[PDB]
Design a protein around this ligand. Structure first.
Ligand SMILES: [Zn+2]
Length: 41
């Protein structure tokens, strides 16, 4: 993985995507991108 560096800065997981983030700002953006998702449909 890209973020496979020895750093404890990456501790943000999106529960739906399983995505690991290292920064808060892009994380919240990704969590705001849930509005672009489809619950089921
Ligand atoms: Zn996500």
């Amino acid at each position: 993985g890209a973020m496979e560096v020895q750093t404890s800065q990456k501790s943000y997981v999106c529960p739906n995507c399983g995505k690991i983030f290292r920064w808060r700002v892009n994380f919240i953006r990704h969590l705001r991108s849930r509005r672009e998702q489809k619950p089921h449909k």
